[PDB]
Scaffold this active site. Structure first.
Site, PDB file in Angstrom:
ATOM      1  N   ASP A  96       9.010 -10.181  -9.357  1.00 14.21           N
ATOM      2  CA  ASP A  96       9.486 -11.554  -9.555  1.00 14.21           C
ATOM      3  C   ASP A  96      10.531 -12.048  -8.542  1.00 14.21           C
ATOM      4  O   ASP A  96      11.154 -13.092  -8.754  1.00 14.21           O
ATOM      5  CB  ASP A  96       9.934 -11.812 -11.011  1.00 14.21           C
ATOM      6  CG  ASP A  96      11.146 -10.977 -11.427  1.00 14.21           C
ATOM      7  OD1 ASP A  96      11.324 -10.765 -12.649  1.00 14.21           O
ATOM      8  OD2 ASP A  96      11.920 -10.536 -10.548  1.00 14.21           O
TER       9      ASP A  96
ATOM     10  N   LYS B 244       7.414 -13.336  -4.042  1.00 13.47           N
ATOM     11  CA  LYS B 244       6.593 -13.357  -2.841  1.00 13.47           C
ATOM     12  C   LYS B 244       5.411 -14.239  -3.192  1.00 13.47           C
ATOM     13  O   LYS B 244       4.641 -14.664  -2.333  1.00 13.47           O
ATOM     14  CB  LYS B 244       6.158 -11.937  -2.444  1.00 13.47           C
ATOM     15  CG  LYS B 244       5.118 -11.298  -3.360  1.00 13.47           C
ATOM     16  CD  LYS B 244       5.272  -9.777  -3.445  1.00 13.47           C
ATOM     17  CE  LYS B 244       4.520  -9.234  -4.658  1.00 13.47           C
ATOM     18  NZ  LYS B 244       4.863  -7.828  -4.985  1.00 13.47           N
ATOM     19  N   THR B 245       5.310 -14.511  -4.489  1.00 10.10           N
ATOM     20  CA  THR B 245       4.332 -15.422  -5.061  1.00 10.10           C
ATOM     21  C   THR B 245       4.673 -16.871  -4.707  1.00 10.10           C
ATOM     22  O   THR B 245       3.831 -17.629  -4.209  1.00 10.10           O
ATOM     23  CB  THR B 245       4.298 -15.262  -6.601  1.00 10.10           C
ATOM     24  OG1 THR B 245       5.636 -15.089  -7.107  1.00 10.10           O
ATOM     25  CG2 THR B 245       3.468 -14.045  -6.982  1.00 10.10           C
TER      26      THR B 245
ATOM     27  N   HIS C  16       0.790   0.278  -4.793  1.00 14.92           N
ATOM     28  CA  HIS C  16       0.685   1.228  -3.693  1.00 14.92           C
ATOM     29  C   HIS C  16      -0.756   1.707  -3.554  1.00 14.92           C
ATOM     30  O   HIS C  16      -1.460   1.330  -2.622  1.00 14.92           O
ATOM     31  CB  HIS C  16       1.612   2.419  -3.961  1.00 14.92           C
ATOM     32  CG  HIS C  16       1.722   3.381  -2.818  1.00 14.92           C
ATOM     33  ND1 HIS C  16       0.676   4.182  -2.415  1.00 14.92           N
ATOM     34  CD2 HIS C  16       2.766   3.690  -2.012  1.00 14.92           C
ATOM     35  CE1 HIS C  16       1.065   4.929  -1.396  1.00 14.92           C
ATOM     36  NE2 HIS C  16       2.329   4.651  -1.133  1.00 14.92           N
TER      37      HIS C  16
END
Ligand SMILES: [Ca+2]
Length: 1202
Positions: A302, A305-306, A343
């Protein structure tokens, strides 16, 4: 503000709480240290509870055993990255230790014994991390397996040793048994799952005891398989664990297996739209040479990068022009952008090639700073080898002190440098993402600034044509008086004629020199990257080259056998292995053009690999291959892909039987022998096993009509009875011949005659008379015109004209392959000559026309017991062009919802229509033989009808020496006959729809296989009768419980498609076919209807002993009885891949036409030129001829238990 920045860091570095959570919680303690820390402590639990509305589906599993007491818990977080983080690991590791020493079964005891420390993380990390279910197991000897961190098992067994529990724990981790043994099954759960599957069966019409017995078998399997005992040991799939255990002195008291995230939903996430719909608030407010640079955002869930990926796109929109990847433009280059939320899940896409990366953008919020789990981010970047990482500090507008920003920078610039990125020199922009959305130029510039770095810092990727020449060799041909030539698609660089080139790969690298470069069309002086070419060489023989090596600029690329790589082996769902593999995996590795087989060694600590997981392995090949790191490869298994991988570092590099293959070969070539008609004998025993009167004579095998009533089960057999022997070519009983075939042929001709006359003269002397037929060809004509065009495009004529297939006027079935069509001169008809001249004018290769006649060969092919089939063999240059319009008609019919490559959508509508009764299925008798010329020109554009007249064969040469001039327009065997009848039928049918107020959309067609709404049928019938066609009243069904279309036959929704014994059965191959077709027609998922099973078993005894037991799964052919392969005694399990042997048709090699095969090769490059995610690394293979002897062979093939 007043609070100094130099001391909020002293608290920051003793708490781990955010930067603004420090700066503000410190202005409240008047600037007192231990005060503010104790304020935050308790002001913390609120944060946590504020989190637990986020779905936490990731996390790790842990396992510890003490002598013979063990325990297993899974603590969840919400991100892959946290699961492997310094701190999070230490937490779950204590909540595990403490749970051992002090044994804690009840999950609440510890969930609350820690709940305080649990907040001592959620605060530091900012992810919902809740210790979820724990349980524990104890026995005499109990073992544990840990598949990385995503799955743990606990196994207890009173009677075994260490190696064993390890193994059986390993199997449990990779097989998910619900019960320890078949009997454990809930007496209730099963007393109803059987009392419910006993309907599935009984409603289908099956008699009580047949549904009973069948359901029971289904039930025995259903259970057995989901129970440890009845699971094929995963390290010896040829035996169950039930037996593995009992053959060992032992037995298992129980097991426990936890997998991370089970039961939890986690509603899917979609990056593309999620940003597009977050900026939907802010949206409401010649230059193709530009490189494509892809980047990826990586950061805290949060930290937004959204929200940043949005700003980037909107801001670069108001300032410039134009696998879930949003894209955006810069005046100089075009960007592709992807999120990195996981990942492992990234490592997978970077290997599977579904998304690489030129630079990452690390997104952290300056509000908080680097989160503890930020180092995992940077570390993911390090491992994947992402060349450059740019850092965007987000939400800076919420930091009223500027020395706090320069503090965060410090923090992140150092992490970056623990992992070998240029920390001191790495660009860092400070700007809010949310404000840059609010059209706030002050923070808008900080975005443009960031893209400004993408522009300059992330280096332009080397264009494919600037790297040293390399062409993967797909095939070698020896061209007379011209020398050797290899064909491929030039992967990179340039090869100019006269340049020197190496051929390196599978043998001692050899050098040569480019004597020329050509495509099928023009000839070239240079070969340019991306192009499909042929490269001519001098002084190199054609057996000194193999498909599999490369052609490259000398010293550019080297041959290697050993390399450590990273691979991702496909999951079950993605069509890969459904079973794990171990230490000695021995698959094939596909390198751009060929399988080369090799052995792998696992890394330090792993001992099992599962379908779906990632893995770093060192592969070592049998013979060398040209490669350097960065080279992708498929992992292959008997032609099926089960993995993908890339080379990471090139290392310096350092079964079957005699009297078994031969024992089976001997059996295969035996001749099964019996008295009378074996086919007929079987059929009769099958009818008998289903209470039906057998066939009195061969005469009745084919003179027997079914009853279209009775239950679906009483009908399925009745139908099979009527079809099963109907195509048997070997009844003597009959003055039956092929003369019967021709009499039909002469009859269709005579009828076409009538309609050619009929269809030119309707002037009823009055004005009154109006007719249905007349009106339909009038409507059909107009619809066709709109669909088709004024005339066949050349753009389409070019991409669809081709050689392919069987015999021509000049080639016999044996010279059928397209290579013998470019080899030998093909005939050609006067009207057609211009087309081949046009072709000859477009290629430098010489297009040769043999004889030049208006004739084709009308010949004869076996088809029934009571008739042969008439067909036509065309001038092969005519065919080349008839497949051309045939191909465009195929594209065009798609606008009518007709897809001629897919008879699947015609089968379903047959099935629907047999429940619904609203669609009818109509069959036409002679069809391909009844499209008269008259009908053709009335219906087709004149431009079309001409090019159809050109390409058609106007006259015919019979076997009787004699001649016919065609009244029909074409016959089956003509390259466009199929589509032209499809289109002619569809339009007629569609027009009848319109005439009746029905949907044209409801008419669907495949050749002479028509489905349309049932009310249109009697009008269709009248319309067909008008235009010539003769409708099969016996095979069109517009009303009963039964439909048939394209080989599937349905009754009230139940599949009743029969099988056929077409030939006298004389060989073991023949028998196995029949036995297998009986298997498929009588199995409801590996479970026999017992009425047939008796007959199957009886006749199985007729085969050579070894062959009774040599079984394969379904979908693998008919070279062995279909059955269980774990039961198969002959199946040799080599290197974790199971090979089973099958009857092959034995074939001798033949010499292929080097020229014609080489034209064929290039003509194809040309064609492809005018047209999981791992098919992009495979090709289409070289031309090899063979003639099948009547003998059989044994081939071993790869199998999987399903
Ligand atoms: Ca049909």
């Amino acid at each position: 503000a007043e609070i100094t920045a130099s001391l909020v860091k002293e608290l920051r570095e003793r708490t781990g709480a955010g930067m603004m959570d420090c700066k503000k919680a410190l202005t409240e303690a008047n600037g007192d240290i231990e005060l503010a820390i104790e304020n935050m402590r308790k002001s913390g639990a609120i944060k946590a509870a504020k989190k637990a509305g986020n779905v936490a589906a990731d996390g790790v599993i842990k396992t510890k055993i003490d002598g013979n007491y063990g325990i297993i818990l899974e603590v969840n977080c919400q991100t892959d990255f946290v699961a492997k983080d310094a701190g999070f690991q230490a937490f779950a590791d204590k909540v595990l230790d403490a749970a051992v020493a002090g044994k804690i079964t009840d999950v609440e005891v510890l969930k609350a014994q820690f709940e305080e420390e649990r907040v001592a993380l959620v605060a530091k990390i900012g992810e919902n991390i809740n210790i979820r279910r724990v349980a524990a197991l104890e026995g005499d000897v109990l073992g544990s397996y840990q598949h990385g961190a995503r799955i743990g098992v606990l196994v207890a067994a009173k009677g075994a040793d260490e190696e064993l529990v390890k193994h059986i724990a390993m199997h449990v981790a990779a097989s998910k048994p619900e019960f320890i043994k078949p009997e454990d099954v809930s007496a209730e759960v099963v007393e109803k799952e059987y009392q419910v599957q006993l309907d599935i069966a009984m409603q289908s019409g099956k008699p009580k005891e047949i549904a009973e017995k069948m359901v029971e078998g289904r039930m025995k399997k259903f259970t057995g398989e989901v129970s440890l005992t009845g699971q094929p040991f995963v390290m010896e799939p040829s035996k169950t664990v039930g037996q593995l255990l009992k053959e060992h002195n032992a037995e298992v008291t129980g097991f426990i297996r936890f997998e991370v995230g089970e039961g939890i939903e986690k509603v899917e996430t979609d990056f593309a739209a999620e940003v597009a719909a977050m900026s939907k608030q802010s949206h409401m407010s010649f230059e193709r040479t530009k490189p494509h640079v892809n980047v990826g955002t990586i950061g805290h869930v949060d930290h937004g990068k959204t929200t940043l990926t949005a700003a980037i796109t909107t801001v670069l929109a108001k300032t410039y022009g134009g696998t879930s990847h949003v894209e955006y433009d810069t005046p100089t280059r075009h960007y592709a952008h992807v999120d990195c939320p996981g990942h492992a899940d990234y490592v997978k896409n970077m290997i599977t090639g579904a998304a690489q990366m030129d630079g990452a953008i690390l997104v952290v919020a300056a509000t908080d700073g680097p989160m503890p789990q930020t180092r995992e981010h940077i570390l993911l970047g390090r491992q994947v080898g992402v060349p450059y990482i740019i850092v965007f500090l987000n939400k800076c507008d919420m930091v009223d002190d500027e020395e706090l920003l320069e503090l965060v920078e410090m923090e992140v610039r150092e992490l970056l440098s623990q992992y070998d990125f240029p920390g001191d020199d790495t660009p860092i922009v400070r700007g809010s993402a949310l404000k840059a959305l609010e059209g706030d130029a002050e923070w808008e510039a900080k975005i443009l600034e960031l893209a400004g770095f993408l522009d300059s810092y992330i280096p332009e990727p080397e264009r494919a044509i600037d790297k040293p020449f390399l062409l993967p060799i797909e095939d070698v041909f020896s061209i007379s008086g011209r020398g050797t030539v290899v064909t491929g698609r030039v992967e990179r660089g340039i090869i100019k004629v006269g340049e020197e080139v190496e051929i390196v790969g599978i043998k001692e690298t050899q050098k040569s020199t480019c004597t020329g470069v050509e495509m099928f069309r023009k000839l070239l002086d240079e070969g340019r990257a991306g192009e499909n070419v042929g490269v001519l060489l001098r002084g190199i023989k054609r057996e000194e080259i193999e498909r599999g090596q490369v052609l490259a600029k000398p010293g550019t690329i080297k041959p290697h056998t050993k390399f450590e790589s990273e691979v991702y082996i496909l999951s079950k769902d993605e069509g890969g292995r459904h079973t794990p593999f171990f230490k000695g995996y021995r698959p094939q590795f596909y390198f751009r053009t060929t399988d080369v087989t090799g052995t792998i060694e696992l890394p330090e600590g792993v001992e099992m690999v599962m379908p779906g997981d990632n893995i770093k392995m060192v592969v070592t090949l049998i013979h060398p291959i040209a490669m350097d790191d960065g080279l992708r490869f498929a992992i292959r298994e008997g032609g099926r892909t089960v993995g993908a991988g890339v080379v990471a570092k090139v290392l310096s590099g350092a079964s079957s039987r005699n009297s078994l293959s031969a024992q089976l070969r001997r059996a295969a070539n035996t001749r099964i022998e019996v008295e009378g008609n074996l086919a007929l004998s079987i059929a009769n025993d099958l009818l008998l096993a289903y209470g039906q009167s057998p066939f009195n004579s061969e005469a009745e095998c084919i003179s027997f009509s079914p009853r279209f009533d009775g239950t679906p089960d009483d009908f399925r057999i009745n139908y099979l009875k009527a079809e099963i022997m109907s195509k048997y070519d070997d009844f003597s009983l009959g003055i039956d011949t092929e003369a019967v075939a021709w009499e039909k042929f002469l009859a269709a001709e005579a009828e076409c005659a009538l309609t050619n006359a009929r269809l030119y003269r309707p002037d009823y002397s009055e004005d009154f008379n109006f007719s249905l037929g007349e009106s339909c060809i009038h409507m059909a004509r107009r619809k066709i015109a709109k669909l088709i065009g004024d005339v066949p495009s050349v753009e389409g004529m070019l991409r669809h004209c081709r050689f392919s297939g069987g015999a021509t006027t000049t080639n016999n079935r044996s010279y059928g392959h397209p290579s013998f069509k470019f080899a030998l001169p093909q005939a050609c008809t006067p009207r057609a000559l211009k087309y081949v001249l046009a072709l000859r004018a477009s290629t430098h290769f010489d297009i040769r026309i043999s004889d030049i006649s208006p004739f084709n060969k009308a010949v004869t092919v076996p088809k029934n017991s009571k008739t042969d089939r008439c067909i036509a063999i065309e001038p092969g240059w005519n065919m080349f062009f008839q497949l051309g319009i045939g191909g465009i008609l195929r594209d065009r019919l798609r606008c009518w919802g007709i897809d001629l490559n897919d008879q699947t959508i015609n089968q379903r509508r047959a099935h629907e229509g047999s429940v619904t009764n609203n669609l009818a299925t109509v069959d036409l008798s002679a069809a391909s033989d009844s499209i008269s010329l008259a009908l053709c020109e009335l219906l087709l554009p004149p431009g079309w009808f001409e090019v159809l007249m050109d390409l058609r064969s106007p006259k015919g040469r019979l076997p009787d020496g004699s001649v016919v001039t065609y009244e029909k327009i074409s016959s089956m065997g003509n390259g466009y006959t199929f589509e032209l009848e499809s289109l002619i039928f569809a339009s007629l049918a569609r027009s009848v729809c319109e005439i009746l107020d029905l949907d044209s959309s409801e008419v669907t067609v495949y050749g002479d296989d028509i489905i349309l709404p049932s009310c249109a049928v009697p009008a269709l019938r009248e319309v067909f009768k008008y235009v010539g066609f003769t409708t099969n009243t016996k095979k069109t069904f517009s009303e009963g419980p039964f439909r048939e279309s394209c080989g599937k036959h349905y009754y009230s929704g139940v599949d009743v498609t029969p099988f056929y014994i077409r030939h006298r059965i004389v060989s073991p191959a023949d028998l196995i076919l029949v036995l297998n077709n009986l298997y498929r027609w009588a199995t409801i998922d590996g479970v026999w209807d017992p009425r047939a099973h008796s007959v199957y078993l009886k006749y199985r005894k007729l085969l050579p002993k070894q062959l009774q037991r040599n079984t394969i799964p379904d979908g693998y052919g008919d070279g062995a009885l279909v059955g269980s392969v774990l039961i198969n005694p002959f199946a040799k399990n080599r290197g974790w891949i199971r090979y089973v042997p099958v009857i092959t048709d034995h074939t001798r090699d033949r010499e292929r036409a080097e020229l014609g095969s080489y034209l064929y090769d290039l003509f194809s490059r040309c064609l492809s030129e005018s047209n999981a995610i791992d098919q992009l690394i495979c090709r289409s293979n070289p031309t090899k001829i063979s003639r099948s002897t009547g003998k059989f062979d044994i081939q071993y093939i790869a199998c999987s238990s399903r």
